[PDB]
Amino acid sequence: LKKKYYEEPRKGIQAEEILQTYLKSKESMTDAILQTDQTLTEKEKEIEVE
Amino acid sequence: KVQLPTESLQELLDLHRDSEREAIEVFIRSSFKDVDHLFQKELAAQLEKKRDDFCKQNQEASSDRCSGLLQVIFSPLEEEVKAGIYSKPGGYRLFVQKLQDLKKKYYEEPRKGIQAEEILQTYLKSKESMTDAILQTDQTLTEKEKEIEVE
């Protein structure tokens, strides 16, 4: 989706700054998905070990 | 008389109206034979343009101050999420309680100005995905603990 955003024309001078501000706003969502993945992966590993 | 951000739009408008009236009185005392009131219309247009500038600058100053304040107040909570403090059974409930306590703290802070609610709502909406990720992690861990206890 970042690659798709780069391909779009007529973004103007704030293209990078707005994208970086947006990506930074989604770091918490990324981290929450990571914690959920790790917790589920550990639970699957325990289920397989059991 | 104007110090930004102003708490209400109304206080800023009243200060503008008083200063505008005094400026019109200064003009009336130093003008004569204003054909078609052309100079008076020019003055009114200049005063309207200044009203719009100062209202915009107040919106910006209020937004920036509130955005910085939310970063200060909720920066520990964001770091606590990154460190996985809420990644445990019942951790979502603790995150929601801490989020409510920090909103209460943000409300107590003075000199937020007219964008206080709008900036806070925009910030809270940006953290819904983080809230949901913590909830999914809590549910998954709580189910795993329940299976471990059942086993």
Residue numbers in the entry:
A (entry chain B): 443 to 492
B (entry chain A): 342 to 492
Article excerpt on this structure:
Host defense against intracellular bacterial pathogens such as Shigella and Salmonella is orchestrated by human GBP1 (GBP1), a cytosolic lipopolysaccharide (LPS) immune sensor and surfactant. Upon GTP binding and hydrolysis, auto-inhibited GBP1 monomers dimerize and assemble into soluble and membrane-bound oligomers, which are crucial for innate immune responses.
The protein coat had an average height of 28.3 nm ± 1.6 nm, which agrees well with the theoretical dimension of a dimeric, outstretched GBP1 dimer (~28.8 nm). We further performed subtomogram averaging which resulted in a map of membrane-bound GBP1 dimers at a moderate resolution of ~26 Å. Although the map did not allow for a detailed molecular fitting of the GBP1 dimer, it suggested the potential oligomerization interfaces: the MD and GED were apparently not involved in higher order assembly, based on the absence of density between these elements outside the dimer. In contrast, the dimeric LG domains displayed lateral contacts mediating the formation of a two-dimensional protein lattice. Within the coatomer, the overall shapes of the LG domain and MD match well with the recently published crystal structure of the GBP5 dimer and the cryo-EM structure of the GBP1 dimer, suggesting that the coatomer is comprised of dimeric building blocks with crisscrossed MDs that are extended by elongated GEDs. The farnesyl moiety can insert into the membrane, while helix α4’ is available to form a stable oligomeric interface via the LG domains.
